[PDB]
């Protein structure tokens, strides 16, 4: 079975659970406030910073290199622009770093440092979702919070180097199917992608609790 298919199949159930997290339900209904959106985007700042450090560390390693797409995909610079927008010029010392965020970062550094054959699972889980449900969320966010079509405060959701997300995802899936693959790597990559989904779910549960507290 091709990796791209194995990953879709492995993560389709936990996807359902993630897209139905209370924080995401509320977001999809349009009940997302500046407070909640700041907390999530700050958390993503730390998450993508770690992920993309680890991508940089492993950019020439063949277990990842075919998916090395900084210009098209990487989010840290976008998130920096969003953090300055939402939190102002001293955002670096204002932004929160929640425990669930720390836990996600920790696993990212474990994977990138010790299990880099699994890094594809973490890239898959975040980037392909940003090009899918993230595009739906971006539109809801604009409407709910009165964010301008010019893009300020939603740089994260904007991919100026991708003309067509549908086509890019197809290319990405096909490239995933070029990685060197054995039954062990395939089993473990799919497992790690389920873990990646759970780390996201836990983050959303945490952020919802922080907002409700």
Verify binding: residue 128, ligand HEM, rule CB under 6 A. Answer: yes
**Residue in 65, 77, 94, 136 binding ligand HEM, rule: CB under 6 A:** 136
15 belongs to an annotated ligand binding site: yes
Verify binding: residue 124, ligand HEM, rule CB under 6 A. Answer: yes
The one segment of 54-62, 79-87, 102-110, 131-139 that binds ligand HEM by CB under 6 A? 131-139
Q: By C-alpha distance, which of 149, 167, 166 is closest to 158?
A: 149
- Alpha carbon distance 95, 79 (integer Å): 12
Among residue numbers 41 through 80, which ones bind ligand HEM (CB under 6 A)? none
Verify binding: residue 133, ligand HEM, rule CB under 6 A. Answer: yes
Verify binding: residue 125, ligand HEM, rule CB under 6 A. Answer: yes
Among residue numbers 142 through 201, which ones bind ligand HEM (CB under 6 A)? 169, 197, 200
Among residue numbers 9 through 28, which ones bind ligand HEM (CB under 6 A)? 15, 18-19, 24, 28
Verify binding: residue 8, ligand HEM, rule CB under 6 A. Answer: yes
Site string for ligand HEM, 84-123 (x = CB under 6 A): ----------------------------------------
Distances (CA, A) of 24 to 122, 146, 200: 20, 19, 11
Burial class (CB in 10 A: 0-12, 13-18, 19+), 212: exposed
- Alpha carbon distance 185, 161 (integer Å): 31
Of 91 and 186, nearer to ligand HEM (C-beta) is 186
Contact criterion met (CB below 8 Å) for 35 and 149 = no
29 belongs to an annotated ligand binding site: no
What the block records as the tokens of 26 is: 């509320």
- Alpha carbon distance 171, 176 (integer Å): 9
What the block records as the tokens of 193 is: 């992608």
Q: How far is the CB of 89 from ligand HEM (least distance, A)?
A: 30
Which run of H or of E encompasses 95?
Answer: none
Instruction: List the binding residues.
Output: 8, 15, 124, 173
Instruction: List the binding residues for heme b.
Output: 8, 15, 124, 173
List residues binding ligand HEM (CB under 6 A). 7-8, 15, 18-19, 24, 28, 124-125, 128-129, 132-133, 136, 169, 197, 200
């Amino acid at each position: 079975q091709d990796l791209s298919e194995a990953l879709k199949e492995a993560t389709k159930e936990v996807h359902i659970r993630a897209e139905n997290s209370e924080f995401m339900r509320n977001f999809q209904k349009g009940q997302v406030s500046r407070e909640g959106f700041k907390l999530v985007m700050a958390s993503l700042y730390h998450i993508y910073t770690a992920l993309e450090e680890e991508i940089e560390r492993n950019k020439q390693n063949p277990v990842y290199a075919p998916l090395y797409f900084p210009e098209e995909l990487h989010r840290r610079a976008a998130l920096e622009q969003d953090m300055a927008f939402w939190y102002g010029p001293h955002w670096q010392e204002a932004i929160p770093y929640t425990p669930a965020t720390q836990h996600y970062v920790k696993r990212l550094h474990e994977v990138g440092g010790t299990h880099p054959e699994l890094l594809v699972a973490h890239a898959y889980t975040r980037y392909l979702g940003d090009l899918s449900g993230g595009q739906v969320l971006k539109k809801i966010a604009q409407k709910a919070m009165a964010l301008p079509s010019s893009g300020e405060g939603l740089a994260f959701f904007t991919f100026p180097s991708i003309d067509n997300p549908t086509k890019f995802k197809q290319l990405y899936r096909a490239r995933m199917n070029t990685l060197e693959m054995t039954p062990e790597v395939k089993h473990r990559v799919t497992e790690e992608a389920k873990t990646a989904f759970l780390l996201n779910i836990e983050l959303f549960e945490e952020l919802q609790a922080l907002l409700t507290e």
